């Protein structure tokens, strides 16, 4: 969610509701993704396209081996 | 209910905290040192 | 709280913030009635 | 049960493979 480039435009409420329902969370871990997105999360520069195909591969073995557990 | 402040209203309220301490040039008080001056001065005037 | 370490986390290592803000849970205890206090501060601890 | 087996099998040495990693092979 955090690397799409869709919600990055700004001032999107997009953000909070794709947590909440995509990657399931509760609002005590909303208020620190915002707090802590702004202390250290860093829009300036985005990511390399090799970060950014290594970290979709990670993704994907991980949610499959976690489909593969449950 | 759970918290009552929601993301967007602490986004505004956080904001202005980094802002304020940024301009500032606020350096984050440290952990108080193991080996430290003032620590029999602070001992004193905490414990009278 | 939930702002609080964070507010705090700005302008105090992280430590001493941990510390005040689980200091402020505790449990309250007037003779029969007891209650968790999440929610709001309790003032009676000297750094309040 | 012996292609369930065979299918255990690939699995296990698979995945002790996938702990010698410290990658696209692997990924694939």
């Given at each position: 969610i955090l690397e799409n480039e869709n919600y990055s435009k700004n001032e999107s409420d997009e953000l909070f509701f794709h947590l909440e329902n995509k990657a399931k969370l509760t609002r005590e871990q909303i208020l620190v993704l915002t707090m802590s997105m702004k202390t250290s999360?860093?829009?300036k520069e985005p990511l390399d396209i090799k970060t950014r195909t290594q970290i979709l591969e990670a993704n994907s073995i991980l949610e499959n081996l976690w489909k593969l557990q449950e | 209910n759970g918290p009552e402040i929601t993301p967007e209203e602490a986004t505004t309220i956080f904001s202005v905290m980094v802002e304020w301490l940024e301009s500032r040039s606020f350096s984050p008080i440290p952990f108080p040192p193991?080996?430290?001056?003032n620590d029999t001065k602070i001992l004193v005037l905490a414990l009278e | 709280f939930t702002l609080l370490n964070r507010l705090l986390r700005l302008i105090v290592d992280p430590n001493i913030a941990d510390y005040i803000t689980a200091k402020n849970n505790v449990v309250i205890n007037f003779k029969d009635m007891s209650h968790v206090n999440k929610y709001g501060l309790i003032r009676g601890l000297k750094f309040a | 049960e012996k292609f369930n087996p065979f299918e255990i099998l690939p699995e296990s040495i698979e995945l002790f493979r996938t702990l010698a990693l410290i990658s696209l092979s692997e990924t694939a």
């Open positions: 999360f860093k829009n | 193991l080996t430290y001056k | - | -």
